[model samples]
Target chain A: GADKEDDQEHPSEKQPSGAESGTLARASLALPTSSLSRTASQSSSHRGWEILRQNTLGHLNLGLNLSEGDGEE
Target chain B: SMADQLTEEQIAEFKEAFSLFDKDGDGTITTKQLGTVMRSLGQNPTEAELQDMINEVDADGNGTIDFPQFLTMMARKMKDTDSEEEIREAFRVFDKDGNGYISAAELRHVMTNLGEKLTDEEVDEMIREADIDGDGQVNYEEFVQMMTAK
Candidate 1:
């Protein structure tokens, strides 16, 4: 029932993509590079912020319409 | 709708600021009250300064500032609440250290894995990530929404 019953890397993060089969060869594929850095705070989600901020910038366009959605026309 | 990017937290602070000065609660802070807010903050502005302040935010130039206007420009000269939150989540997943700006190094890693290694889910997950809101199950409904939305 439990043959590979061994665990050690402390499993710090939940599901990193190496979250599966083989020698975990794709580790480098899903890891590395970043967005917030510790300096950014709530570095947990750059995704939700980007698109939603897209909406904000979309209005920033109209506001730019008002001001810089920053443009002239 | 414009403020869809803001949090209950931001709007919360905004009301408190407007509240202390907007005695009328007309959902907006008018001229004189605008000065009251300005003054209380230790800001002694000339009529000109106030004019400039309202100048940007007074969308309709009604000699006043509505919550929407305040929310807009006040939010304007100021910014960056949380788009980073979602980005950080997905970006954090890959670059746990929060650095994944996709350097050439990371790019090569993906390209090697890019071609028919067979795990299309991997790359698909990479690009299709931002759509994490209520995804997969009604992949059909989302499909239709995209179809007509276009």
Candidate 2:
């Protein structure tokens, strides 16, 4: 069957430069480290609220835009 | 050409919309930026797990979200949501505690797993604003209320 027995991790997330293979590994290479590094570096900051807010809105906007297309700019 | 999906121009605009959430060009977006942006856009989430709860948007893994990835991610979310209730239901799963609320640590754990790191303060603030009742915990009631309020 085309549907395999084993499950795969979500395609969007970037796996670390480990032994994981396939398009995911290749995709990971395409993504720059600067993004993950910045995210990792902020772990120690006291700006949880700000960070979370930014994240929440971004998701919401993306979600909404996704449903209907981008809105008037 | 209406394929029930967003077009490229619409996708580009969507990218700009999400980019509005990034206060810093550092590529990595924080929760605060997310929350404030939502509020400005006339929407808000009360008991969301974390603002930084992303994987699909950060296509390049540069910590910052890019247009191509952002478009596909957001479109996928809307496609999944048959209604607003679906959106709320999705948020509830992340709440985990059933207290109708989600904590920073709770969100932090999830975000990290999704491949994004969170600042302690960033996660904490997310909780504080979401708490709404001043009881230090946010409930789905409060959460939904805030969402509809926007």
lDDT (10s digit) by residue, model 2, range B85-127: 5445545555544334565555665565334455455565555
Chain A TM-score, structure 2: 0.17
What proportion of the real contacts between chains A and B does each prediction keep? Answer: 0.00, 0.15
Candidate 1, A1-73: lDDT as tens digits: 6576676675466666644423212224444344222432322233222332343234232222233233332
lDDT of 1 by residue, B5-100 (tens): 456675665577677765555556776677667665445878788667656765566877656556546544555556534433333232332222
User: What interface root-mean-square deviation (Å) does model 2 yield?
Assistant: 14.4
CAPRI docking class of candidate 2: incorrect
Off by over 4 Å in 1: A1-73, B1-10, B45-47, B80-150
Please name the candidate that would achieve the greatest lDDT relative to the true structure. Answer: 2
